[PDB]
Amino acid sequence: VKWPRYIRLQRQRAILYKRLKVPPAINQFTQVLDRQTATQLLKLAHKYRPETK
């Protein structure tokens, strides 16, 4: 498909982060908490939510 410009631009922005040498201070955010610890963290964080309006 001949995709629109914004779709093509974001898709080959996603490829440039795989091509170019990402410095470690930006690369450290790709290293992420795994699937089971995040649910425990949000389960704990649901008990300390700020009040609504």
Partner 1 sequence: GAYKYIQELWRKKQSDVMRFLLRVRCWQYRQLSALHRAPRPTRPDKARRLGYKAKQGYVIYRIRVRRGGRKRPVPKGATYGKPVHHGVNQLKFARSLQSVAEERAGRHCGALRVLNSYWVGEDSTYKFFEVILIDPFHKAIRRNPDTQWITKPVHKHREMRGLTSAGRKSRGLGKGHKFHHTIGGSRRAAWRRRNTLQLHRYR
Partner 2 sequence: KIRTSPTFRRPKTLRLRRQPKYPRKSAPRRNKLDHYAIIKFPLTTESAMKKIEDNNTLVFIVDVKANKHQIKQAVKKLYDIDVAKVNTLIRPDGEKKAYVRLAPDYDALDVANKIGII
Partner RNA sequence: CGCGACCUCAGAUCAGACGUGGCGACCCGCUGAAUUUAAGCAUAUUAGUCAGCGGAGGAAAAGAAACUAACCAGGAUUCCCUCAGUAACGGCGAGUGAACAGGGAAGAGCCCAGCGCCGAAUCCCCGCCCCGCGGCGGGGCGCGGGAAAUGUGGCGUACGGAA
Binding footprint of partner 1 on the chain (CB under 8 A): 5, 9, 13, 16-17, 20-23, 25-26
Query: Taken in order 34, 42, 26, 5, is the CA torsion positive or negative?
Result: positive
Answer for the pair 33, 41: CB distance below 8 angstroms, yes or no. Answer: yes
Distance CA 11, CA 22 (A): 17
- Nearer Cβ to partner 2 (2/46): 2
The answer to whether residue 4 forms part of the interface with partner 2 (CB under 8 A) is yes
Using the rule CB under 8 A, give the single segment among 1-9, 14-22, 27-35, 41-49 that binds partner 2: 1-9
